[PDB]
Design a protein around this ligand. Structure first.
Ligand SMILES: [Zn+2]
Ligand SMILES: [Zn+2]
Lengths: 101, 154
């Protein structure tokens, strides 16, 4: 609920019901850090950079993880991002995920 | 306000309690947290008779984009050019991780000062000299430190 939680990126605490829990890891991220990280990754990096800013997970080298990860991240990004950035997410996702190793 | 301001205030509060050993005299205007000045004070020959002023320039998008380091003091080193640009892999755009904090960046910088990386140099002449005959390199670097370096603090 309203108990405070430290942002894993910037180190500042907010009520937990304002924070963004990344479904794939246990990091809690504040809304501003969340929006900035994923917006910059979309506009300036690759869709493989769409991972946690504090721990770098998940490992997007496992193709069996991609649908679960990106479909859950989708819902968080729709509420967080500006409409143009959310549309860019879908464009990049439609273009595919480069599989590193 | 911005992620950069929150994050850099966090980093500064952690440095101000645990001062860094080889990075001293850290100066940051609380009105502009995106530029830090400080003094690099190396521990080993050939650089341990001088100190080196540096500036850390953080982008407005920090910590989601890396800082840049510029030496203001001249230094004789294969990985630092004559304009003070430093090739430091941990803060390259291709390597940058937003979780990296400035204390780790400085530790990485000091490790580079201690152990040049002549395989990827900004001054190929000095990289050759460091690889073929370090004793000669070390004498040249000591003299350059004496001639153009800054005075060390106590
Ligand atoms: Zn934050
Ligand atoms: Zn995480």
């Amino acid at each position: 609920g309203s108990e405070f939680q430290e942002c894993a990126v910037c180190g500042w605490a907010l009520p937990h019901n304002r924070m963004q829990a990344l479904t794939s890891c246990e990091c809690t991220i504040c809304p501003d850090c969340f929006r900035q990280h994923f917006t910059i990754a979309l506009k300036e990096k690759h869709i493989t950079d769409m991972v946690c800013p504090a721990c770098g997970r998940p490992d997007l080298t496992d193709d069996t993880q991609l649908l679960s990860y990106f479909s859950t991240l989708d819902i968080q990004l729709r509420e967080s991002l500006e409409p143009d950035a959310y549309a860019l997410f879908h464009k990049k996702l439609t273009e595919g995920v480069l599989m590193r190793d | 306000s911005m992620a950069a301001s929150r994050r850099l205030m966090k980093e500064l509060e952690e440095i101000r309690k645990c001062g860094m050993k080889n990075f001293r005299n850290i100066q940051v205007d609380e009105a502009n947290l995106l530029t830090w000045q400080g003094l690099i004070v190396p521990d080993n020959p050939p650089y341990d008779k001088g100190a080196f002023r540096i500036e850390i320039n953080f982008p407005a998008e920090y910590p989601f984009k890396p800082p840049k380091i510029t030496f203001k003091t001249k230094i004789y080193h294969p990985n630092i050019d004559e304009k003070g640009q430093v090739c430091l892999p941990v803060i390259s755009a291709e390597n940058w991780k937003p979780a990296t904090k400035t204390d780790q960046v400085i530790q990485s910088l000091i490790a580079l000062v201690n152990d040049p990386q002549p395989e990827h140099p900004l001054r190929a002449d000095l990289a050759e000299e460091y690889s073929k005959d370090r004793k000669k390199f070390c004498k040249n670097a000591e003299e350059f430190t004496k001639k153009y370096g800054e005075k060390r603090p106590v």
